[PDB]
Design a protein around this motif. Sequence first.
Motif, PDB file in Angstrom:
ATOM      1  N   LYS A  13      51.867  31.023  39.551  1.00  0.00           N
ATOM      2  CA  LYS A  13      50.483  30.710  39.224  1.00  0.00           C
ATOM      3  C   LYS A  13      49.910  31.759  38.285  1.00  0.00           C
ATOM      4  CE  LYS A  13      50.277  27.087  41.896  1.00  0.00           C
ATOM      5  NZ  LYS A  13      51.724  27.064  42.246  1.00  0.00           N
ATOM      6  N   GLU A  17      48.401  30.960  34.558  1.00  0.00           N
ATOM      7  CA  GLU A  17      47.046  31.376  34.209  1.00  0.00           C
ATOM      8  C   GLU A  17      47.038  32.608  33.313  1.00  0.00           C
ATOM      9  OE1 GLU A  17      47.595  29.476  36.602  1.00  0.00           O
ATOM     10  OE2 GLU A  17      45.803  28.349  37.153  1.00  0.00           O
ATOM     11  N   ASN A  22      43.995  32.134  30.467  1.00  0.00           N
ATOM     12  CA  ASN A  22      42.861  31.553  31.170  1.00  0.00           C
ATOM     13  C   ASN A  22      41.693  32.525  31.092  1.00  0.00           C
ATOM     14  OD1 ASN A  22      41.048  30.280  32.881  1.00  0.00           O
ATOM     15  ND2 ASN A  22      42.615  29.703  34.382  1.00  0.00           N
ATOM     16  N   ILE A  25      39.174  33.742  35.952  1.00  0.00           N
ATOM     17  CA  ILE A  25      40.040  34.034  37.089  1.00  0.00           C
ATOM     18  C   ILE A  25      39.148  34.000  38.325  1.00  0.00           C
ATOM     19  CG2 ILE A  25      41.437  35.749  38.263  1.00  0.00           C
ATOM     20  CD1 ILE A  25      42.701  36.529  35.764  1.00  0.00           C
ATOM     21  N   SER A  26      39.383  33.032  39.206  1.00  0.00           N
ATOM     22  CA  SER A  26      38.502  32.829  40.347  1.00  0.00           C
ATOM     23  C   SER A  26      38.720  33.898  41.408  1.00  0.00           C
ATOM     24  CB  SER A  26      38.732  31.446  40.951  1.00  0.00           C
ATOM     25  OG  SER A  26      37.927  31.257  42.103  1.00  0.00           O
ATOM     26  N   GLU A  28      38.027  33.315  44.803  1.00  0.00           N
ATOM     27  CA  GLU A  28      38.688  32.581  45.874  1.00  0.00           C
ATOM     28  C   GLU A  28      40.176  32.429  45.593  1.00  0.00           C
ATOM     29  OE1 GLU A  28      40.099  29.591  46.932  1.00  0.00           O
ATOM     30  OE2 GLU A  28      39.769  30.156  49.026  1.00  0.00           O
ATOM     31  N   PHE A  29      40.536  32.268  44.320  1.00  0.00           N
ATOM     32  CA  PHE A  29      41.940  32.272  43.931  1.00  0.00           C
ATOM     33  C   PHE A  29      42.604  33.582  44.334  1.00  0.00           C
ATOM     34  CE2 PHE A  29      44.571  33.853  40.261  1.00  0.00           C
ATOM     35  CZ  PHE A  29      45.763  33.331  40.714  1.00  0.00           C
ATOM     36  N   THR A  30      41.929  34.700  44.073  1.00  0.00           N
ATOM     37  CA  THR A  30      42.480  36.011  44.388  1.00  0.00           C
ATOM     38  C   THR A  30      42.626  36.243  45.884  1.00  0.00           C
ATOM     39  OG1 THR A  30      40.291  37.018  44.370  1.00  0.00           O
ATOM     40  CG2 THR A  30      41.480  36.890  42.296  1.00  0.00           C
ATOM     41  N   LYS A  32      43.506  34.658  48.266  1.00  0.00           N
ATOM     42  CA  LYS A  32      44.703  34.090  48.865  1.00  0.00           C
ATOM     43  C   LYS A  32      45.982  34.771  48.392  1.00  0.00           C
ATOM     44  CE  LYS A  32      44.277  31.808  51.545  1.00  0.00           C
ATOM     45  NZ  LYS A  32      44.033  32.397  52.891  1.00  0.00           N
ATOM     46  N   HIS A  33      45.896  36.008  47.907  1.00  0.00           N
ATOM     47  CA  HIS A  33      47.074  36.703  47.411  1.00  0.00           C
ATOM     48  C   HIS A  33      46.941  38.196  47.676  1.00  0.00           C
ATOM     49  CE1 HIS A  33      47.733  32.869  45.602  1.00  0.00           C
ATOM     50  NE2 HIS A  33      46.868  33.048  44.621  1.00  0.00           N
ATOM     51  N   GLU A  36      47.944  41.707  43.167  1.00  0.00           N
ATOM     52  CA  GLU A  36      47.801  40.838  42.008  1.00  0.00           C
ATOM     53  C   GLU A  36      48.411  41.433  40.747  1.00  0.00           C
ATOM     54  OE1 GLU A  36      46.900  38.194  43.376  1.00  0.00           O
ATOM     55  OE2 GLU A  36      46.456  39.460  45.111  1.00  0.00           O
TER      56      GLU A  36
END
Lengths: 59, 25
Positions: A13, A17, A22, A25-26, A28-30, A32-33, A36
Amino acid sequence: VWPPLNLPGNASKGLTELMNDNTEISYEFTLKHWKEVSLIKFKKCFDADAGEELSIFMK
Amino acid sequence: SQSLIQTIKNDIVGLKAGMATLEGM
């Protein structure tokens, strides 16, 4: 541009991105990881330079 | 059966990522 010379670690992902550049960069996306990115090297500089703004060390 | 190749690939790269995290210190 946001040109990191790293992230070989985990995220395809991140691959998408990043390779698409992109502009967003959200958060909420971050959440979950883990781990990074770490632009950790010893080679050169990025988006910065030194030896200017004569106000500081003249005060 | 041949899916196991990509399974072990992604798993071992995740393991090297964990090894980097361990390098974090």
